Design a protein around this ligand. Structure first.
Ligand SMILES: N=CCc1c[nH]c2ccccc12
Ligand SMILES: N=CCc1c[nH]c2ccccc12
Lengths: 109, 361, 105, 360
């Protein structure tokens, strides 16, 4: 279920799901580097009915994973609300900005 | 008998050319610009643009400008963000202009990589992730300096009625106007009143740009305007794209470069889809709606062909649309657009197409 | 007809036909550079020596990919071999497309 | 609160891993190696390899070696041909080894990028277009020898029964053997008699490699052998893969890395297709034939699944086949191979798959 674009935590993923790329929803694939910055989504948990903040850190410094591409846009906003925006590379400030995949890190309610 | 030669120019004249910016997202380090003849679908050439290239054509039609990022070993080593100047007719590299290592990496919205009306400056979006606007002096081949006043703003809307002025959309829901001096530094600036509610009616960044005003559409199908005929920008809106029937079926805009303006007629073109709700703002077009911006009424609606981005040519009265891979060519000389042809397989992953400029002084 | 992999002179092309890439059978697309070296094929005109120079210094054209192998031989017959990049000695070896140049009988 | 971390190792044991070299020919500047678990099809990670990368795993299983070309601005600027050493478990870059700017740019035949049996030297094919073989000392991280004796030859076949010896196929239809010293410089060499007629019965370069001999198949379905049990290589052949019925339907070999040998049994695996004629030598397999190299007779034939390349794991008795995009996993512990699974979408454009070494 986590490898599906419709998994609830992936509601603002624009990218490849890291869990399909040799990582997990909270770990980068081997040899790719987490971004220290991210866009944030607010996603509805279908189990408890509560909304959670999800931080979409990218994994960086390897070329595109290519698997499980998603483009979900729940509560996503344009670049004038920058940290809600997912049409930019959240690897942009990494030592190497090449985009590998996107994680879906649960922050809290 | 025969001898292979290079050094050749593009085979079709400039006025036939369009530029399809192929992000090649699946292999984003090998993005490129594909050059096509829109009159017959012929592939004419290409310009390689490395990682997540952006592209525009010089206002005078002579050069192609690209913006890209290199690293010494691609996935490791020192970063070089650059603008490149390419000859439009030979599709050859001429000059690299060094940028600070914070040029925007992102999808190809027009407003991330623009130029002043007079063509003397390239105006680009930076994100480090702090935002600023970068200014490149074309004649000097130099980066000037960051427009730090644009922190917390996004994207570049040139003012076609002034030589070296542009606007950006700020997080307060207003517009910041920047007026450059002849050296490319900020000579003056101003901030409009709030145009739109960021929380309640966010707008798409893509302008429907007139010579002295710009229109914007919102996530909920409202229209906002910024009039820059005077030194201070005057803002207004909303008015709705939607009638009762439209509202009942939850029609809203969606796409990327999703609007356009035919300046002579005041017709605005917008990609629309039904069953709008939170999260559908980048959905492919079910339809293109054509709005008269004077009467604020829809004058046509046609099938969208799943388009996501468009561009308008004022000099030939054309609209191109683009679904990611295929380019549709429309005659928009009358209120109802007429589909002329589709160019299949123009790109693997493109959200931006542009005409080679004709005229436009 | 020239844009088809079955066109008679393309009988040992491994690559993208330059004629589909903004060039022609004997001219590189704008901004790409001919290779000074090539593999050579022998093709029947429904027999001619055809030199398969590549065009180089731009990324892959991607159009009209062909993989025809008439009389092609492995790398111990190196100039008959088409599984190598004939841009390999160019100033920039990035492979763009392949041409099919008639040499003679 | 969850926290994203890096620094992780590949999640499956080395013995489960295979390496699919994706040329990504449509975007050949972004070639890469995809790492998969053959037991379940799971994608484990990848190594980027820039323009037309080649790959191998160190014989000791600890490192991945890549070979590639960079330019300062990709399509312009100074060229750098390199070998890179990567950690096999962390899939991280460790070291770059500079090569002269003539490493072979070409499709991923195994024999273009190999290593000595002892693992101490990488042995790679150059083409400028003049050919030579380059030697990289792994420990020193240096290019240490350039075997010009191999001009006019092609590809590297290591001898598994010697620590630092390999062969190459020469334009005379014979083999050149190179024995490297412990410094990676040529210590001695020898040339075989003619094995095959270059003009009349050209062989595919891919060896079916035993511990002390190698077999090669030809464009017309013959088999040649090179015995390197001694210092001097002894060559023989042809025998035919084909019986009279096979000949009637014009069966011939085709593919890229198109053969393999199961050393314990002497079974040779070959991709074959009917209706052979000039120009069909790279056609996808209609069948895989299983040949007894001792009796010189076919023992089995199975559907080929349009495969083009293969590789064998001796100790687990496995064969992988590869059709360009999909990897088929076969059990070859008995004469008839048994298909265990297919890994779909393992690559966009791969002609080479390899197992992680387990034999030390
Ligand atoms: N999580 C965002 C991936 C992405 C979205 N757009 C991009 C442009 C360039 C590089 C990466 C991206
Ligand atoms: N005419 C040969 C194209 C080609 C065939 N194999 C290649 C490998 C790398 C670069 C180019 C090639």
């Amino acid at each position: 279920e986590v490898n599906s674009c419709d998994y609830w935590r992936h509601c603002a993923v624009d990218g490849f799901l890291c869990s399909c790329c040799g990582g997990t929803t909270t770990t980068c694939p081997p040899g790719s580097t987490p971004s220290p910055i991210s866009w944030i989504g607010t996603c509805h948990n279908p189990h408890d009915g509560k909304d959670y903040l999800i931080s979409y850190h990218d994994c960086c410094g390897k070329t595109a994973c290519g698997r499980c591409q998603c483009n979900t846009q729940t509560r996503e906003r344009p670049g004038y609300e920058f940290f809600l925006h997912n049409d930019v590379n959240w690897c942009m400030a990494n030592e190497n900005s090449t985009f590998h995949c996107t994680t879906s890190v649960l922050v809290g309610l | 008998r025969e001898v292979l030669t290079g050094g050749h120019s593009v085979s079709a004249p400039q006025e036939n050319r369009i530029y399809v910016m192929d992000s090649v997202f699946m292999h984003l380090t090998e993005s490129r610009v594909h050059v096509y003849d829109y009159t017959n679908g012929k592939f004419l050439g290409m310009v390689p643009t490395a990682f997540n290239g952006h592209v525009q054509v010089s206002n005078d039609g002579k050069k192609i400008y690209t913006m890209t990022t290199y690293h010494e070993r691609i996935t490791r080593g020192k970063r070089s963000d650059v603008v490149e100047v390419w000859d439009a007719d030979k599709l050859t590299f001429e000059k690299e202009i060094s940028l600070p290592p914070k040029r925007v990496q992102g999808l190809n919205y027009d407003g991330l990589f623009r130029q002043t009306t007079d063509g003397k400056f390239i105006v680009l979006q930076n994100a480090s992730p702090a935002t600023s606007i970068g200014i490149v002096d074309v004649a000097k081949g130099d980066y000037v300096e960051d427009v730090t006043a644009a922190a917390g703003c996004w994207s570049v809307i040139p003012q076609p009625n002034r030589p070296r002025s542009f606007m950006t959309i700020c997080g307060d829901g207003g517009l910041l106007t920047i007026n450059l001096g002849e050296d490319g530094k900020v000579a003056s600036q101003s901030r409009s009143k709030q145009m739109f509610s960021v929380k309640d009616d966010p707008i798409f960044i893509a302008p429907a740009l007139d010579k002295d005003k710009a229109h914007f559409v919102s996530y909920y199908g409202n229209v906002y305007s910024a009039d820059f005929s005077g030194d201070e920008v005057k803002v207004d809106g909303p008015w709705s794209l939607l009638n009762d029937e439209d509202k009942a079926k939850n029609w809203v805009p969606g796409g990327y470069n999703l609007v356009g303006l035919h300046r002579a007629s005041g017709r605005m073109y917008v990609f629309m889809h039904p069953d709008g709700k939170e999260g559908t703002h980048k959905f492919p077009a079910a339809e293109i709606w054509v709005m008269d911006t004077k009467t604020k009424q829809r004058v046509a609606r046609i099938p969208g062909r799943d388009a996501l981005s468009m561009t308008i040519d004022q000099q030939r009265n054309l609209m191109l649309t683009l679904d990611g891979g295929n380019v549709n060519v429309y005659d928009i000389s009358q209120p109802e657009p007429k589909l002329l042809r589709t160019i299949e397989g123009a790109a693997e992953a493109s959200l931006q197409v542009q005409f080679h400029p004709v005229g436009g002084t």
